[PDB]
Design a protein around this motif. Structure first.
Motif, PDB file in Angstrom:
ATOM      1  N   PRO B   5       0.828  -1.200   0.000  1.00  0.00           N
ATOM      2  CA  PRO B   5       0.000   0.000   0.000  1.00  0.00           C
ATOM      3  C   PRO B   5       0.858   1.243   0.000  1.00  0.00           C
ATOM      4  N   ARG B   6       0.482   2.242  -0.772  1.00  0.00           N
ATOM      5  CA  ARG B   6       1.093   3.541  -0.674  1.00  0.00           C
ATOM      6  C   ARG B   6       1.028   4.145   0.722  1.00  0.00           C
ATOM      7  N   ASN B   7      -0.033   3.900   1.498  1.00  0.00           N
ATOM      8  CA  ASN B   7      -0.135   4.389   2.916  1.00  0.00           C
ATOM      9  C   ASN B   7      -0.628   3.337   3.907  1.00  0.00           C
ATOM     10  N   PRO B   8       0.323   2.576   4.507  1.00  0.00           N
ATOM     11  CA  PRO B   8       0.036   1.455   5.408  1.00  0.00           C
ATOM     12  C   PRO B   8      -0.825   1.840   6.619  1.00  0.00           C
ATOM     13  N   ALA B   9      -0.648   3.003   7.154  1.00  0.00           N
ATOM     14  CA  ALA B   9      -1.437   3.444   8.314  1.00  0.00           C
ATOM     15  C   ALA B   9      -2.919   3.574   7.933  1.00  0.00           C
ATOM     16  N   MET B  10      -3.154   3.993   6.691  1.00  0.00           N
ATOM     17  CA  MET B  10      -4.522   4.178   6.196  1.00  0.00           C
ATOM     18  C   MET B  10      -5.094   2.924   5.691  1.00  0.00           C
ATOM     19  N   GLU B  14     -11.091   2.581   9.802  1.00  0.00           N
ATOM     20  CA  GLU B  14     -11.329   3.514  10.879  1.00  0.00           C
ATOM     21  C   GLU B  14     -10.337   4.674  10.826  1.00  0.00           C
ATOM     22  N   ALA B  15      -9.084   4.412  10.510  1.00  0.00           N
ATOM     23  CA  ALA B  15      -8.099   5.484  10.368  1.00  0.00           C
ATOM     24  C   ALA B  15      -8.474   6.390   9.198  1.00  0.00           C
ATOM     25  N   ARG B  16      -8.970   5.813   8.096  1.00  0.00           N
ATOM     26  CA  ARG B  16      -9.420   6.624   6.944  1.00  0.00           C
ATOM     27  C   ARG B  16     -10.596   7.474   7.364  1.00  0.00           C
ATOM     28  N   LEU B  17     -11.555   6.955   8.091  1.00  0.00           N
ATOM     29  CA  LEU B  17     -12.717   7.674   8.492  1.00  0.00           C
ATOM     30  C   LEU B  17     -12.326   8.865   9.340  1.00  0.00           C
ATOM     31  N   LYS B  18     -11.435   8.676  10.306  1.00  0.00           N
ATOM     32  CA  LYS B  18     -10.974   9.782  11.142  1.00  0.00           C
ATOM     33  C   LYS B  18     -10.355  10.935  10.371  1.00  0.00           C
ATOM     34  N   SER B  19      -9.743  10.617   9.228  1.00  0.00           N
ATOM     35  CA  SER B  19      -9.096  11.660   8.412  1.00  0.00           C
ATOM     36  C   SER B  19     -10.071  12.700   7.898  1.00  0.00           C
ATOM     37  N   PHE B  20     -11.379  12.428   7.928  1.00  0.00           N
ATOM     38  CA  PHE B  20     -12.384  13.352   7.432  1.00  0.00           C
ATOM     39  C   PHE B  20     -12.916  14.324   8.484  1.00  0.00           C
ATOM     40  N   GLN B  21     -12.233  14.413   9.618  1.00  0.00           N
ATOM     41  CA  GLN B  21     -12.626  15.356  10.655  1.00  0.00           C
ATOM     42  C   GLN B  21     -12.930  16.758  10.148  1.00  0.00           C
ATOM     43  N   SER B  36     -14.859   3.700   2.849  1.00  0.00           N
ATOM     44  CA  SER B  36     -15.156   2.324   2.418  1.00  0.00           C
ATOM     45  C   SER B  36     -14.507   1.976   1.090  1.00  0.00           C
ATOM     46  N   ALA B  37     -14.379   2.964   0.200  1.00  0.00           N
ATOM     47  CA  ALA B  37     -13.748   2.821  -1.125  1.00  0.00           C
ATOM     48  C   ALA B  37     -12.238   2.947  -1.075  1.00  0.00           C
ATOM     49  N   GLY B  38     -11.649   2.942   0.126  1.00  0.00           N
ATOM     50  CA  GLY B  38     -10.224   2.998   0.274  1.00  0.00           C
ATOM     51  C   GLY B  38      -9.600   4.368   0.409  1.00  0.00           C
ATOM     52  N   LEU B  39     -10.454   5.398   0.437  1.00  0.00           N
ATOM     53  CA  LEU B  39     -10.017   6.778   0.291  1.00  0.00           C
ATOM     54  C   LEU B  39      -9.965   7.509   1.633  1.00  0.00           C
ATOM     55  N   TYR B  40      -8.945   8.352   1.806  1.00  0.00           N
ATOM     56  CA  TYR B  40      -8.820   9.171   2.982  1.00  0.00           C
ATOM     57  C   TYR B  40      -8.557  10.622   2.576  1.00  0.00           C
ATOM     58  N   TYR B  41      -8.808  11.523   3.497  1.00  0.00           N
ATOM     59  CA  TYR B  41      -8.717  12.939   3.182  1.00  0.00           C
ATOM     60  C   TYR B  41      -7.284  13.425   3.267  1.00  0.00           C
ATOM     61  N   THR B  42      -6.848  14.154   2.251  1.00  0.00           N
ATOM     62  CA  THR B  42      -5.492  14.715   2.207  1.00  0.00           C
ATOM     63  C   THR B  42      -5.377  16.031   2.972  1.00  0.00           C
ATOM     64  N   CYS B  50      -6.180   7.237  -2.231  1.00  0.00           N
ATOM     65  CA  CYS B  50      -6.311   5.807  -1.912  1.00  0.00           C
ATOM     66  C   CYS B  50      -5.082   5.291  -1.141  1.00  0.00           C
ATOM     67  N   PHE B  51      -5.337   4.590  -0.025  1.00  0.00           N
ATOM     68  CA  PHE B  51      -4.253   4.029   0.760  1.00  0.00           C
ATOM     69  C   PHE B  51      -3.485   2.952  -0.001  1.00  0.00           C
ATOM     70  N   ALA B  52      -4.118   2.301  -0.971  1.00  0.00           N
ATOM     71  CA  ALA B  52      -3.566   1.162  -1.682  1.00  0.00           C
ATOM     72  C   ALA B  52      -2.758   1.624  -2.876  1.00  0.00           C
ATOM     73  N   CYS B  53      -3.413   2.239  -3.876  1.00  0.00           N
ATOM     74  CA  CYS B  53      -2.749   2.594  -5.134  1.00  0.00           C
ATOM     75  C   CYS B  53      -2.090   3.979  -5.065  1.00  0.00           C
ATOM     76  N   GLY B  54      -2.465   4.792  -4.090  1.00  0.00           N
ATOM     77  CA  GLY B  54      -1.976   6.148  -3.992  1.00  0.00           C
ATOM     78  C   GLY B  54      -2.648   7.160  -4.913  1.00  0.00           C
ATOM     79  N   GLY B  55      -3.618   6.747  -5.706  1.00  0.00           N
ATOM     80  CA  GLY B  55      -4.320   7.699  -6.565  1.00  0.00           C
ATOM     81  C   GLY B  55      -5.071   8.724  -5.766  1.00  0.00           C
TER      82      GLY B  55
END
Ligand SMILES: [Zn+2]
Lengths: 4, 83
Positions: B5-10, B14-21, B36-42, B50-55
């Motif tokens: 994964p481009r971002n192992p922590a994400m 739950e860690a991705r969800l928190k990023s949307f604070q 749910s789709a793998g995406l977290y807020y930058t 995306c935590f996986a592909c980094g897109g």
């Protein structure tokens, strides 16, 4: 959406 | 492993969800759907990653779904292909  | 994964922590939804604070109030997609789709807020605009592909995706439009935009732009992502 667009890709960055 | 043979993928990484481009971002192992994400890695964690739950860690991705928190990023949307501080997801902006004009951004219509829900943190639930995006995470749910793998995406977290930058932290910038409505730009997610995306935590996986980094897109990275931004400028979401009405009618967009998180998974379909993820798969349309990054079809070879292991998270997309593992779904
Ligand atoms: Zn991806």
């Amino acid at each position: 959406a667009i890709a960055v | 492993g043979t993928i990484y994964p481009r971002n192992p922590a994400m890695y964690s939804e739950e860690a991705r969800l928190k990023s949307f604070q501080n997801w902006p109030d004009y951004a219509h997609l829900t943190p639930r759907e995006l995470a749910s789709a793998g995406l977290y807020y930058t932290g910038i605009g409505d730009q997610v990653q995306c935590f996986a592909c980094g897109g990275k995706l931004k400028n979401w439009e009405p009618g967009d779904r998180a998974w379909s935009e993820h798969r349309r732009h990054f079809p070879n992502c292991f998270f997309v292909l593992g779904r």
